[PDB]
Amino acid sequence: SQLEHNIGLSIFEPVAKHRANRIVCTIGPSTQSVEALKNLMKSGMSVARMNFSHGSHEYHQTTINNVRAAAAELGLHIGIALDTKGPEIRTGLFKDGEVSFAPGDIVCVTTDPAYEKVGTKEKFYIDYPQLTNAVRPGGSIYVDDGVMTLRVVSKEDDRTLKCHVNNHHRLTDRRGINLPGCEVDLPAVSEKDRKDLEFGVAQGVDMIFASFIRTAEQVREVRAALGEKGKDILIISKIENHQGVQNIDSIIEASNGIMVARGDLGVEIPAEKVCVAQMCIISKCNVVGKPVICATQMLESMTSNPRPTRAEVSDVANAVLNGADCVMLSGETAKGKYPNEVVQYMARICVEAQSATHDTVMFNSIKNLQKIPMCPEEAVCSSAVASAFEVQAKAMLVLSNTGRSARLISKYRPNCPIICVTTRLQTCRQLNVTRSVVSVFYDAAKSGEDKDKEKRVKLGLDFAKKEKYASTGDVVVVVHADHSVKGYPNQTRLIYLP
Amino acid sequence: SQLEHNIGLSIFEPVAKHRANRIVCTIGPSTQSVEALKNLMKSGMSVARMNFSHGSHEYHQTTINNVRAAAAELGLHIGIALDTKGPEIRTGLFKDGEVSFAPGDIVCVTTDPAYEKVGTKEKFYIDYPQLTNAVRPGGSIYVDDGVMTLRVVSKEDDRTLKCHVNNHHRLTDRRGINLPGCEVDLPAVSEKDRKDLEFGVAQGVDMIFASFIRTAEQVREVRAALGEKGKDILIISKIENHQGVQNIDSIIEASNGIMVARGDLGVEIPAEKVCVAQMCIISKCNVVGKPVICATQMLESMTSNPRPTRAEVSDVANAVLNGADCVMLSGETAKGKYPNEVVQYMARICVEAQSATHDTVMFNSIKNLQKIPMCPEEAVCSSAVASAFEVQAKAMLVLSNTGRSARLISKYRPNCPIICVTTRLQTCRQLNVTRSVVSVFYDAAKSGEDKDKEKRVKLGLDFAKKEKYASTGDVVVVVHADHSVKGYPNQTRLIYLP
Amino acid sequence: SQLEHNIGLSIFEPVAKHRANRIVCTIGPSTQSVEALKNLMKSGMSVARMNFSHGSHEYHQTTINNVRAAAAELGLHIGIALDTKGPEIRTGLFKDGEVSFAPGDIVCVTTDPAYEKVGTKEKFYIDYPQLTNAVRPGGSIYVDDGVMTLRVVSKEDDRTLKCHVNNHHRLTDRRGINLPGCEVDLPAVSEKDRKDLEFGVAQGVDMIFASFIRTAEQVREVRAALGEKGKDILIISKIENHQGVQNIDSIIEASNGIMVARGDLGVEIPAEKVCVAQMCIISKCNVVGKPVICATQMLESMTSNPRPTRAEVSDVANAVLNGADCVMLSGETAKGKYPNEVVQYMARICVEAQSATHDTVMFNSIKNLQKIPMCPEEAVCSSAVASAFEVQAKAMLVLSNTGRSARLISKYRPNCPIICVTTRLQTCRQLNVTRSVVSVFYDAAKSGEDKDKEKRVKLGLDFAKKEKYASTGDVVVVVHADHSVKGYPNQTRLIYLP
Amino acid sequence: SQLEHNIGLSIFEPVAKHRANRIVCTIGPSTQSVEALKNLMKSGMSVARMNFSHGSHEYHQTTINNVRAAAAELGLHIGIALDTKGPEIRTGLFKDGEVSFAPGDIVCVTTDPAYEKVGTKEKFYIDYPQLTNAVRPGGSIYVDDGVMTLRVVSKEDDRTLKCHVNNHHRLTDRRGINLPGCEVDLPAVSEKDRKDLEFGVAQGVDMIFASFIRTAEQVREVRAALGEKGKDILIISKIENHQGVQNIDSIIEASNGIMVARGDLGVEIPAEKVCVAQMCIISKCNVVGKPVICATQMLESMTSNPRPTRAEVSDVANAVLNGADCVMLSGETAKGKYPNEVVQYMARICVEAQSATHDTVMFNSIKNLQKIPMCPEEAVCSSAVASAFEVQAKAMLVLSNTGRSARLISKYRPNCPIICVTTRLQTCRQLNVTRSVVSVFYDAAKSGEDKDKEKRVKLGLDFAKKEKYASTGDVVVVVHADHSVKGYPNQTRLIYLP
Numbered sequence A, B, C, D: 001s002q003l004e005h006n007i008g009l010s011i012f013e014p015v016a017k018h019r020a021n022r023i024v025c026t027i028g029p030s031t032q033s034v035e036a037l038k039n040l041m042k043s044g045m046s047v048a049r050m051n052f053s054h055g056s057h058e059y060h061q062t063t064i065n066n067v068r069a070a071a072a073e074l075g076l077h078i079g080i081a082l083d084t085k086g087p088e089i090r091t092g093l094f095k096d097g098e099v100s101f102a103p104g105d106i107v108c109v110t111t112d113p114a115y116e117k118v119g120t121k122e123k124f125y126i127d128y129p130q131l132t133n134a135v136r137p138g139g140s141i142y143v144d145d146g147v148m149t150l151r152v153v154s155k156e157d158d159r160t161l162k163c164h165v166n167n168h169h170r171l172t173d174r175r176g177i178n179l180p181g182c183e184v185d186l187p188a189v190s191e192k193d194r195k196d197l198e199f200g201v202a203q204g205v206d207m208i209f210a211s212f213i214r215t216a217e218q219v220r221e222v223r224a225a226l227g228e229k230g231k232d233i234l235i236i237s238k239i240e241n242h243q244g245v246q247n248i249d250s251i252i253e254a255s256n257g258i259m260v261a262r263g264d265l266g267v268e269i270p271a272e273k274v275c276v277a278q279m280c281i282i283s284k285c286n287v288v289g290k291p292v293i294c295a296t297q298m299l300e301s302m303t304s305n306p307r308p309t310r311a312e313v314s315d316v317a318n319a320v321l322n323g324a325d326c327v328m329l330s331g332e333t334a335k336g337k338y339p340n341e342v343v344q345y346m347a348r349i350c351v352e353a354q355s356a357t358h359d360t361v362m363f364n365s366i367k368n369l370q371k372i373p374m375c376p377e378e379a380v381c382s383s384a385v386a387s388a389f390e391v392q393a394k395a396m397l398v399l400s401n402t403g404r405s406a407r408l409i410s411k412y413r414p415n416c417p418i419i420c421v422t423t424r425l426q427t428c429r430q431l432n433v434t435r436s437v438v439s440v441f442y443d444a445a446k447s448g449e450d451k452d453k454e455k456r457v458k459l460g461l462d463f464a465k466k467e468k469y470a471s472t473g474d475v476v477v478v479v480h481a482d483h484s485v486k487g488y489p490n491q492t493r494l495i496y497l498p
């Protein structure tokens, strides 16, 4: 039982030597140089997130180039994630750049572009043109991560709402706007998003984090936008509002993976419900073997301080115990003072949580929920993990070209590394959002066809030696096809490292 | 499985009506007035904590008096808790009142009290005579709540260690010292704590939060100092370092309760290891059925902000899911801008975690670790909770004078309120640290001795109707003695509300 | 697991001191005298079965009188069961009293009464007048517990079938006939059965074993036949053919209990399927808390030998492990040479099997299958058994007038005796088919009303002492109503024997 | 739960097509002819047992020869088993060849061989010199297979016990003696058994059924007597007394297999305790994955009758449910009237119990008791069975030369056939005592050495199609080595049938 497990825990035991969970870092001014990226990577960044809410194509092009250069210098496969603006709503500017509000303060908000740059305590601009359809008298506008709320007193005209300010707040430029439970219908893929996606395909990004996905239909819109050259890019749907949570099953089925985007989520639904949605979403993803990323304010204080709070440490540990493949940093690495240290903390916490995890509870729970009969490869991969447990394998080794077989082994949550020898660099980069997987590239053009898998296997075992996963005499659980079968693995071997 | 339970959660269903977990709030300049305390109570404070690290008896006398006036106004039983200064190691003073250190600086630290008042960059004093036995070369000394860290390079004589400064810091006079992983030997009760404990006894406080408990002997020393007149006051041992964690079993056995005091604990042991300690301590308390409080930085940012971070919301929920009876607020209510809002959030988060808890999993896990045969009162109590699940009881009712039986029922973690009818105001106040319990006071001097239980039972059932726990024709599970047995409950009845 | 349980078993441990399972003995020429009945009772007979397939009312009247006289002499409540002939089919007589058959031997069978007494190798009588409707050319008649089969070659006339004999057999007088998978529609209650039942009610029999029940409708026919004076008599339906097994759920719902009548069953369906039907039927009865009796050829060889076979011993043990309340003897005690010894064996085997049973596996399995919410009394009774386990109670004590509450405690299969104090002698006799129950009679006319239950409780505890179930200082789990509630028990006490 | 599994059984569904359990038949005058043996084999005999308690080498040579001729005619691999006379204690002779005892008679029994030939009512001889140490006053001596029992009253000298006859019996010359509960010390291999064992080795028998194994030392003595030339013959230790049961762990560890020999065992220990021994022994064998045979009186009555009793049908089914690989027939096929019918019933009952077995419960229970880490071959084998359940494989296929791997797979109790392709006729014959296994012989001398497994694999898959286990496009789970590993299987494949 969880209880009996807990009472046996020790703060005195050694921790896991190889970190299973993966860390996503948002790049910004703190972290864009090749050098800063090298150090993020050294600290434990597996994926680099470009936030296309801000910056031009040139700015992100510099991110892309710098990532590839850092990674090549270090010998790493680092994923690059394009995170879409999507249907964001913001304020315009204000005279000076701040204004200040008190409760009962009556403020007019307008969609008139003419007030964009020149906003005040009585009148300012919001860039959602359908504002006065979206929210009626009595409804509520949430401003700046929902810190200040505005009650709508009346519709003045089609362009203008008169609003009752409900509390004190310090209003900076171009702040976020949220409209919980309103008829907001903006596209999942705007004109702006469409260009950003096209740029992603051109630049060969590995995955999209698609903001504000509320339907499987919207996931497909993002797929269609990425066009023909873009079909192998992962779509991770960001769950961020009421509808996203409601439609989660079918959003999951359409997507390659999911981010719990707790930032917008905890404004869009009451903040205290985010914990329930997180547990629910992470688990649903585990059950179908699709990567899931927990995001936002995980080590937030560390944007300014050299140490995290107690809450932040448990938040990271619990995202891991919840079953998340990945944990994410946003402001902390994009614009914080301690990018490297925050990533290092997150890593150390990950490894604690991983060492606190009961070995086989996930394996069993997940297995018990799968429809029988399985397809052969899933039977191979689950039984492979089972026999890793039974022999205390220090590693597994799987040949995967698309990444499918590596994600399938990971679905069953072994307690050791999954070394994946792949024939595609993009698979190396994409498997970064999958717990436990460590990727090695086999260049089949340079080295030959490897029909019998002996070149790729040897390369995986040599990697196991060099990275100190296992030594001579240790058992490794090796998964690929036999000599005939094409398209999936049908075979498991147990192998002593030579 | 946890996993299956997760996938079946819904964020949309109504949540529990009756909050099970309890909330300790620290009093300070934000919250001390009778007014402020009324609102704290309306907001969900069950226990008021006095931090005797700071302030005179005069100050805390106001807190005591004001709490009692606030509660009497509202008709509530509110626990009062004295949280001791506790032992501490501190540096000496510095020339000119301050000194600045830089990475690489070599500093001697001495227990020669000749140096007490003349600290320099070269050399300063620490007031723990045993220093050079307790920390060996290669060990760390943390200074100023962990902010500066020294590595011990070597021992120069039996009173002097040569050290290496690890980071930039400015020290002033008499900063805190921590000796992570070190067997420290200080009195459990200092001269100051005696006076504080004598005061608490005289003013009739309900519980001690005893700082930095290292051993069971220390709990017994704190009991000894409370004397005959204080023999009924709960000792809640604060676990704040590795020794506390090492000795948890015997400490639990000696105490009435435990606080996982994460502030100091996150300084004394690596921060990532606090989550493992927390899980283990809470579970170990659950197993023996003693209240445990999770503490510190649970909602830190709300000291300044009117909404909590995502990490924070999850910290509170997980403490509840871990199995804590209580969660606690320090800074957030002592000195913060939003004392009420922060308690209200904590209440709402508690309820969400509660509502997301699988009913019976804790009950079974806890019951399966009990040694057979049980005492009869504990069979009666666990079977009472069993029967409450079997009939979906909306409430249970117990008669307890010391509060033992109420704690024994709570131990088995029913999903409904446990109404306790008691003959001691102090029991009402003390039962505030126990999950699910709601106390009603029966005045025996004023209503007769109730040998046959009938009046106390009616009082409880009336209370069930008033407080809207249950109504006419609902089954309530009622626990007390039969007509002849004294000293413990040997009887469970199921009763329909008339 | 069953496996892990088994490997821990010992042939060297002491056995249970109090036998939970109950033994039904068929009375005949070996066993009808008062003296032989005294000895059967001493050996461990709990219920006496009158087989109304044979004997007149006078003969059974002698059984009834002799049972009551034996039991009164010994101070016992012994149940009396009337087992109906029902829709039996038999042969008539033969010249001399045997004839002999060989394979290919062509035999005419007739329903013509005129051939009743005078049958031969070529022509004989079967007492089912619709024979030549029931079975067509190609069908099969099973003769003498299905030892010889006859293939029907043709219908000669409406009275006569020409048959192909399929094997060698030695044919004695008035042998049994079975017609698997034929359109046999005889009444569950014939004219003969109706008189036998009426006689049962007049004579105050405790239960009916109703032969060949194939529908819930038929159970109700037996209920209607017992008329108004007969409504409190248990109907145990004998499952004995295809249709009985098919309709088992609804037969169970209509009945008070079930016998697996393996004799006719294993002719009516292939013999090897009886093991599957037994497991299935016993378990279904366990799940609704209705008594079930395993019957027939359990110690068959002991009809002639002083020791049973190895198969017979395991058959009895496994009926007990299967969950049967009772095991039955037929020929073995009715006409065998070793009535006393066979009953003694059966008892010793019962106690072995009982001691081999895992304590709580039945409790849990049964509890997990019950619809929530339970009614209050079932919550009381299941939790009562749970707390017996938790305190290792050596006994339970329940007040039951109808027997309902005693059968409800038994449903949850405690590992100790259930002492039942009842106000009806008929409840004492009827509870003999319920595992674990030991009955004490409280005469409320002689001793007064006992509203507070103190007279009945005292009588139960005194019985516990005298029968050596528990001594002074031992805990007993006592179940009845509190001082107000009428009609079911709402209360559980744990009591130390004074 | 077993209980839930039961209630869901249906007597009407089709049963398993492929019988998993195996049937040992004893040869005798009923069954010795080549004709009789062909029919036995067609009826379901896998192993022919020779009881060397009776008959010359000449006789058993006919059995051996005839079995081999019968099998060669039918194309079957049939095991031949030599079941030893084993140790025995017997009385001396009596004056006039016989003597009659009555309850209450006092008889001296002496180990003074002066009395060997002059037994009277007053005094007779028992040929066990250690008698007066092995049984103390108050202990029993069983005479004539338990039929007569004596209580030891006292020890008269160091060679004489005064005894009390308990029941009527007639003794003749040299009756059996059993000393229930007594530490008896006889050679494991008598002078007669040597000759018998030498014979068996020379005639190439597949297995010894070694009578009355008390200790592991005895198994080793039997191995020693088999010598170098017999090192490959299975030793199946017969557990026939309390010592066998006491020492089961070490006996199991020394043996290749176990027979629960219930005949003698039911004489040596109370008969009701045989069921406990049986359950424990079968389970303990299952846990280490060695074949166990349940024996004796399983279908006793069918020695004389053409149908079995209800007890008997249940005995066989329960032995299968207990987890026995094999069940056995002695008298029933050696000397009975219905040797074929009895085997056919046993086959049909086996199949019904099999069909009623919960698929995976044995697999999980067995796997959960294995020590971690496993050997790799055992991980491969248990995970292979896992994967067979996951894909509902209709068969598994293993290459095994010694039969180790076939036993290792069977250990995990898959629900389908285990096809074993082996290079040793003797392995085929020996695998007959192992649940589920069906052997096919690959002739390496005649078809080449098959380093790459491809021919043996094809042979097995062809065999799967012919024997109708599976057809085109069904998944079969295939276990052997990869191309380099020798001595054990390290590889599992899932393969569709071409």
Ligand SMILES: O=P(O)(O)OC[C@H]1O[C@@](CO)(OP(=O)(O)O)[C@@H](O)[C@@H]1O
Pocket: B398, B399, B400, B401, B402, B403, B404, B405, B406, B451, B453, B479, B480, B481, B482, B485, B486, B487, B488, B489
């Ligand atoms: O104060 P605790 O130790 O909880 O004991 C209370 C129990 O003991 C009893 C019996 O002594 O108290 P009471 O005498 O006040 O009625 C039970 O009724 C009651 O449930």
Ligand SMILES: O=P(O)(O)OC[C@H]1O[C@@](CO)(OP(=O)(O)O)[C@@H](O)[C@@H]1O
Pocket: D398, D399, D400, D401, D402, D403, D404, D405, D406, D451, D453, D479, D480, D481, D482, D485, D486, D487, D488, D489
């Ligand atoms: O005879 P056992 O001990 O079962 O070993 C058989 C196993 O060893 C191997 C490998 O040595 O035999 P083989 O060399 O005959 O091919 C595996 O292929 C086979 O499964």
Ligand SMILES: O=C([O-])C(=O)[O-]
Pocket: A211, A238, A240, A260, A261, A262, A263, A264, A265, A295, A296
């Ligand atoms: O967009 C995000 O990542 C969020 O809102 O957390």
Ligand SMILES: O=C([O-])C(=O)[O-]
Pocket: C211, C238, C240, C260, C261, C262, C263, C264, C265, C295, C296
């Ligand atoms: O009638 C019976 O009892 C039987 O057939 O077993």
Ligand SMILES: [K+]
Pocket: B051, B052, B053, B083, B084, B085, B086, B211
């Ligand atoms: K303090």
Ligand SMILES: [K+]
Pocket: D051, D052, D053, D083, D084, D085, D086, D211
């Ligand atoms: K023998």
Ligand SMILES: [Mg+2]
Pocket: B211, B240, B261, B263, B264
């Ligand atoms: Mg502290």
Ligand SMILES: [Mg+2]
Pocket: D211, D240, D261, D263, D264
């Ligand atoms: Mg024997």
